[PDB]
Design a binder for this molecule. Structure first.
Ligand SMILES: [Mg+2]
Ligand SMILES: [Mg+2]
Lengths: 320, 317, 320, 322, 317, 319
C-alpha cells in the first residue's frame, strides 16, 4: 500500500457520506485518481499503474451501493488500462490518467447544464409537463425550456412519503414557472392534459430500465397508455451493468410513512412497507436524456461499453 | 299539497344531516312511502300527481346526489306503470308502498349481500389490494375471511384525506392482516396481488367507474398484470349518464391552510375528488343482486329504475 | 293501394327525393294517406291494404336504410294492434297516429341530436370531423351557440371534397376551422379532444358504415384515447351484421377520383377503385348520438327492437 | 515553398451546387459530398499529415454547412471523416492518411451507386408471388423493391395511395404501370378498407430517427398504424445515409396553396386555416423492418447502423470538429 | 305429484344414460313437455305447482351440467310469464308444451344452424385451425366446404386424449385437406392461418370461453397475429356465472398407469381438462340463432333463458 | 500441408461421429490447436496459410452448422489480428494455440457458468417452467436448488419426442419437486409461474431464439403474464444470420404419428412436424451465457466481441 493521503481522505468523506449525490461523488473519485497521478513517488511504468489500481480499489470499496462511483473509476481506469497495456511509458501513462479524470470531472460539472440543453430541444411552447420526486436533471430541462422563452406549465406530483414534490414545486415556481401541485394518485387523471413527462433516475439498468422513487413506474405506465412522450434525464454515470427488472423485485424506515408517535398506536398485525424505488420497464420510456445526448433506453449497454469500457469480459480495470 | 312527513326528510338531506349513499336513498324511499301511507286523495288522479311533487321535492334537494334519484325512480316507475295501465287509490297506493318497502329492505341488506357475492370470488391465500374506505369493498373482505378464507389486504394510503388509515385499522381489528403503502406503491406490489377490490361513488351507462382519485391508476396496473379486478357497488349507484370524455375539492385538504399561505402565488394546488376508471379495466361489478359485467350497467338501469332511451323522468310531464 | 302511396314510391325510386330523413318521413306520410283515405269496409281487408302499401314502398329502394325503418315503425305498431282484435277504425287510428309521430320525431332529429351531443362537448374542445354530416355539424353549431369556444379540424374527405363544404359552413358561423388533407388525421389526433362524425348506417352491433376514411380516423382516435362520437338518427340503424358474411357496399364512379379527361391520359392497366364507405368496428366508437339520446354501440339492437319492433326470429311486419 | 490553397477549388464548387440546389436527391448529394472529400484528399498540396488533416476538416466543415436540412449530406461526411480521424489518430503518415480517406469516399460512392439495386433485392426476398402490395408517396427505394420482385418472376399487384396534397401517387401509378405492373389507384382515405386484402406494405423514408422512427410524407404513419392493426408485413426501404442521430422531426409546414389553390383560397374566410404538414412520424413499433443497402434490420437497430457506418457515438464533436 | 315419465328421464340424466349438452337439454325439455301433456291437474295453480316440482327434480340430477338448467329456464320462464299474467290451465299447459317443442326442435337444428352461420364467415381459399373435436366447429367447416369453398384445416393434436386424430379423419372423410400437427405448433403456423374455429364446453357471463386445455393458448397467439377467431357454441352452453379470474382429469390420461408407476414420487402429473379463454381473444361466438360478440353473451341469457338480476329460478318459490 | 489430426477430426465431424454444440466446437478448436502445435512452416506467412487451410477444411464439412464456425472464428479471428499486426511465426503459433485453449476450457465450464449466472436471477420459492430438455436450462435450476432455494419446476411434456419425461425425471433426481403437464397447458399454469427458463438451438443476430417447437408459444404467454423469461445458451450458439426478412427443419412425421398408425390414414391428411419455433427477442428478457446475462438485442455484440464477426468483413480464414 503506497497511496497518497489525498486519496485516503476523499474515500473517507465518501465512505462516511460527507460527499453525497451521483455527480459530486463521481467527480470526487475521479479527482482522487487524478491526485494519485499528479503527486506520485513512482519511478517506473509499472509501479505507477500498480498504485493507480491500488487507489481505485479503495475508492471503489467505500460504497458498494454508490452508482456513479464505480463508473468514474471505470472511466479513468479503462482508458488507463488500455494506454497501459499499449506499452505506454511512465510519464505517458500518467498523462492519460490525468486527462481522463480531468475530462470526466469537467464533463460532469457541465452535466446538469448540457442535459438541460438536450432535453429543452424536446420541449415545446405551451407544453404541460408532468414530473415526479425532486430531480435536478429533470428540473434543469424545464428551467432551460423556460429560459428559452418557452411557455410551459409543470404538473408536480406530491411524491409521498418524503414529499419531494414540495421542493420541486417551490423550486420551479421560484424561477417563475407556473406549477400545478397534485397528489400522486392523480397522475392518470391529469395525464390527459400532459404533453411531456420528464423525470430523473437513481440509476439505469443494462436493459435500459429505470430505477427511481416509487410511483415513477406508475406515471410512466399511464403516460404510455396516453402516448405521452416520456423522457428520463440521467447522467451517463448512472448507467448500471446489472439487471434489476426481475432481480430486485431497498426498504426504508416505515416511520417515513406513518410517524413514530402514530405508528406505535397502531395494531400489531398491520405492516407498513416503505419501498424506496420501483422499476420502470424500458418500453414505458421513449428516451433517456444524458450529458452526451438523447438516446433510446435499450442503448444503455452501448453507453456502458463506449464510456466505461464494459463488456462480458467481467473484469474491472483495477482488477486482473 | 305535500305532507310534513316528506319535507321532514328533504330538509335533513338538503342540509347533510342524513348523509351516506345508502341512508339517503332509503330516506328518500321512506319519504315516498309515507306520502302514500298518510294521504287524503280522492281517486288515483289526485293521488298520483300528489307524489310527483314528493318525488320532485326530494329530487331537487340534492341533484348532485346519486342514490337520491334512483330511489325515487325505483318506486315512481313501478307507480307510473300501474297508474298508466289504470288503477284506483288502493290499487296504485299499494304498488307504491310495496315497492318503497322492498327497496328499503333491499338496501339494508345491500352491504351484507354484496359481501356475500364478492366473497365467492375470493380464494384462500388471496392477497387483496384496495383503495379509499368503501364499506362495500370491506364487506367483501370481511366475508371471505369470516368463511375461513386466509386473505391478506394491501391498503393504499389514499391521499389527500388518508382514508387508508381508517381501512387499515378497521380490517386489522377483524383480525385481518394488513399491509399499508403509499398510493405510489400500487404498481410495485401489483406483482404480488391476486385480487383488486374497490368501491365506487357511481357507475356510468357505459360501465365506467367514478371513484376516489387514484382508483383508475390502480385498475390500470391491475389490467397490466392481468389481476382480476372487482368493483363493489350497489345498484342505486348506477348513473344513466356518461362521465368519460370533474369535482374539485378544498386545496387545503392536500396542503394545510397555514402551510399553503407560504407557497408562491404561481403554484396552484388541484384536488380532484375522483378519476374515471374505463370499463375495460374492470372485470365485474358486485351488486346486491349479483355479479355483472361493467357494460351491463345499461341493463340494470332499465330493469331496476326503468330507464329508456327516449327518456323523461317518471315524476314530470 | 291508393294513389298517393304510389306517387310517393316513384319519387323515392326515381330518387326524385332523397336524404335519410326526407324519404323516411315521406314513406311514413304515404302510409298515413293510405290509412286516411282507404275505403276498406273490413278490418282484415284494411290490414291487407296497408301491407301492400308498404311492400310497394319497400321495393322502391331496399338499399336505403331509413325507408324500411319508417315502414317498420308504422307497420310494427299496426301489426301489433291488429293481432289484438282491433277494429277497422282502431287500426286506422293506430297507424295514422304512429305515422305522424314518426314524422314529428324525424323533423326534430337534427336539433335534438345537436342538443344531446353538445352536452358532451366542453369549452376549449378541438373537434375533428369527416365528410359533411348534418347531424355532426348540428352538434358543433349547438355547442358553439351555447357559448362554448371550439376549434374544428375538418378533414378534406376526398374524392368529392366534402371537407370544403364543412369548413366553409362551420367557419361562416364563426367557428374557427383547421382544414387538412385526410392523410393528416393521425398527425393531428394528438391535439384533438373529440371526434364527431356522421353515419350512413349503423349495424345491429353498433358498427358504423360511413364515408371512406371514417374508420381510419376512428382507428387513430382509439390509439390516442380520443372520445369518439357518432351522430346518427335511430332510423339509420340496420338489422344487418358485418361479423358474418363479408359485405362491401357500393363502388362509385372512378371519375370522382380522377376526372374523365385526365383518366384517358393514363395507362390501361391502372384501375381506379372508389369505395363509398368503410366499416368502423363498434370498439372504436364510444357513443352514438341519437335523437332519443346517447347510447353505447352495443345498445344498437335495443333501438331496433324497441323502436322498430325488429326481431331476430320474427318476420317483416308487412309480410305474410 | 509549398504554397497552396487550404481547401481545393473542386470542393468549393461542389459545395456551391449543393447550396444552390443544383444538385438534389439523398443519393446524389451524399455522393457529391463524399466525392468532394475524395478530390480534396487526391489534390491536397499539403506536406505533412497534420496540415493535411486540418485542411480535410476545413473541407468537410464547408460542405456540412451548405445544407443543414439535407440529411444524407452529413452522413457522407461522417463516413469519410470518421475513418480518416481513426487513421489519423493512430499515427498514420500523409501517404497512409490520404489513401484511407480516398478509399473511404470511393467505397461510400460505390455503395450509394448500388444502394437502390441492393435495397431492391433485399426487399424482394420478402415479397411472394401473388402478393398485393400497398405503397405511399413516390419512393425510388420502395419502387425498386417492387420492380425487382416483379422482375424475379413474382406476379404482384400494387395498391397505390393517392398521396395528397401533391398527388405523388399518380407518378407512382403511371411508373409502376409502365414497367408492366398492375395498379389499383386509391384515395388515401381507403388505406384501412383495403388493408384486409393487402399482403405487404412497402414505403420509403425521408429519414430514420435514432429510435428507428420513420419520417416520411404525411399519411405514412396512418397507413402503418392500420397495417399493424391487421398484421400486414410492413417494410420501409431506406439507404443507411438517411439514418439520423436525432429524435422525432430533428427540425415542416408547406405552402397552404398546395392543398387549396390560391384562386380558390382567396375566396375562403380567414376564419379557416389550411395546415399542410409535409411529414408525419411513424413509430418504430408499426414497422417490421427497414430495408437497407446492407440488409434488413429491425427498427431499433437504427442506432447500430449509425455507429457502424458513421462512427457515431455519444460525443460532443463531429469527426471534422476540433 | 310428478308423472312417471319425468322420473324416468330424470334418472337417466342422473346416472348418465343421457349425456352431452344437446341430448341432456332436449331430454330435460321433453320431460317438462310430458309433465304438461299428462298432468292430471284440474286447477291452474296445482298444475304450475307440479311443473316447478318436476323442474326442481330435473335440475337436481346433474347440478353442474350446463345446458340442463337452461333447458328448464327456457321452458319454465315462458311458463312463469303466462302463469303470472293470469293464464288458465289450458293456456299455460299450451305455452309450456309449446315452449318445450320449440326448444327441442331448435336444439335439433342447432349444429346445422351454427354451421351455416359460421360458414358465412369462411372465405374461399381460407385456412382454418381448430382444436379438440367439436361438432359445432366441425359443422362450420363441413358446411363451408359443402358450399363449394376450398379450405384447408390445420388440426392440433389435442393432448392428452388425441381428439385431434378423430377430427382429422372425419374432416378428411368429407374430402377436406387436413394438416395434423402437435399443439405446440399453434403459434408457428398461426402466421398461415386465416381463421380459428373452435368449440366450447360453456360460455361465461362475460363471454369468456371454457374449453379443452390449450384453447386459450391458441386464441392468444391468434389475437397476437390478429386472426379472426370464432367459437361455435349453442346458446344453452352460455352460463350466468363467471369462471375467469376447473375439472382435474386422471393423470393416467397423460402418462399411462403402466409407466407412471416408474417415475419418482417427487413428480406430479397435473391434467386439467379446461382453461379459460378471455373474451378479448375471441371475435365472435357462433350460435344457432346468430353470430354474436363475446360481450353479447348476457343478452342471450336474457333473451333466451329469461335471465336477469333476480334471485330465483322460474321454478323456485 | 494440413496436419494429420486435422483431417482426422474433420472426418469425425463430417461423419456425425462427433455431435453436439459444445463437443463439435471444442473438437474443432482443438484441431486448429494441433495444426499449430505440429506445423512445419518456415515463416509466418506460410504458416498462416496452413492455418487458414485447416480452418476452411473444418468449416466445409457442415457449412450450415452454428457452434462449429464460432469455434473457428474464435481462434482464427485472434490469429488474424496477430498476423496483421506483424506477428512473427512463433508468436502467431502462440496466439493460435492459446486461443484454442481458452475456447476449449471456457466451453468445458460453460454449463457450470450458465447455471451460476442463471441461479443469481432465481429467487427462493420461485416456480420455474421449462420446455424440451436443455442441459443449460436444467443447469440453472439445479444450481438454484442446490443453493438452498426452494423451487418447484413445471416441466412441459414437449411433443412429439417427449423430452419432458427426461427433464422431469432428471430434475426429480436432484431432489427438485416437479410438475409434469402437457404442452397445451402452458398458459393455464403461467398464472402461477414466477420465472421461465428454456434453452436454445441458436440465437440470431437480432436476438431471436430458435428452439424446440412450442417454445415461442410459452414465451408468448409469459410476456402476457409479465413473467421474467430467460434463455440459457452458450455464446457459440449465436448465429450471424437473420430470420426477419420458410421452414427451418421438417422432422420425420413418424415422431408425431407412428408408421403403423399413419399408414392407414388417407391422402387428404398430411402431418407437419416442424422441429423449431422462432421466438421474437421481445418475448425474452435476458439470455444466459457462460460470460453473463445479456439482453437479446445484444447478440450482435457477442458475435462481434467474442468471435470478431462483422457484416462488412469476411471470415478470418478467407482469402
Ligand atoms: Mg344489450
Ligand atoms: Mg447494439
Amino acid at each position: 500500500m503506497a497511496v497518497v493521503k489525498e486519496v485516503l481522505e476523499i474515500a473517507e468523506k465518501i465512505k462516511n457520506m460527507e460527499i453525497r449525490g451521483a455527480g459530486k461523488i463521481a467527480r470526487s473519485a475521479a479527482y482522487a485518481l487524478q491526485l494519485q497521478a499528479e503527486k506520485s513517488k513512482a519511478t517506473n511504468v509499472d509501479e505507477f499503474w500498480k498504485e493507480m489500481k491500488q487507489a481505485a480499489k479503495i475508492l471503489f470499496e467505500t460504497r458498494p451501493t454508490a452508482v456513479s462511483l464505480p463508473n468514474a473509476l471505470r472511466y479513468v481506469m479503462h482508458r488507463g488500462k488500455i494506454a497501459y497495456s499499449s506499452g505506454a511509458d511512465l510519464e505517458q501513462l500518467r498523462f492519460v490518467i490525468i486527462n481522463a479524470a480531468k475530462e470526466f470531472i469537467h464533463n460532469s460539472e457541465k452535466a446538469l447544464e448540457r442535459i438541460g440543453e438536450f432535453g429543452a430541444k424536446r420541449i415545446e411552447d405551451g407544453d404541460v409537463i408532468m414530473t415526479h420526486c425532486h430531480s435536478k436533471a429533470a428540473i434543469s430541462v424545464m428551467k432551460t425550456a423556460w429560459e428559452q422563452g418557452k411557455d410551459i406549465k409543470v404538473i408536480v406530483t406530491e411524491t409521498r412519503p418524503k414529499w419531494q414534490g414540495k421542493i420541486t414545486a417551490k423550486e420551479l415556481a421560484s424561477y417563475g414557472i407556473p406549477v400545478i401541485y397534485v397528489v400522486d394518485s392523480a397522475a392518470r387523471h391529469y395525464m390527459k392534459m400532459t404533453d411531456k413527462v420528464v423525470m430523473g433516475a437513481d440509476s439505469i439498468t443494462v436493459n435500459g430500465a429505470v430505477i427511481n422513487k416509487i410511483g415513477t413506474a406508475l406515471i410512466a405506465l399511464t403516460a404510455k397508455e396516453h402516448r405521452v412522450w416520456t423522457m428520463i434525464a440521467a447522467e451517463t454515470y448512472k448507467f448500471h451493468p446489472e439487471t434489476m427488472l426481475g432481480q430486485l423485485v431497498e426498504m426504508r424506515d416505515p416511520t417515513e410513512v406513518i410517524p413514530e408517535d402514530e405508528l406505535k398506536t397502531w395494531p400489531k398485525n398491520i405492516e407498513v412497507w416503505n419501498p424506496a424505488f420501483d422499476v420502470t420497464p424500458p418500453e414505458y420510456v421513449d428516451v433517456i436524456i444524458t450529458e452526451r445526448g438523447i438516446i433510446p433506453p435499450y442503448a444503455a449497454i452501448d453507453i456502458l461499453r463506449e464510456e466505461f469500457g464494459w463488456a462480458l469480459k467481467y473484469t474491472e480495470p483495477w482488477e486482473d
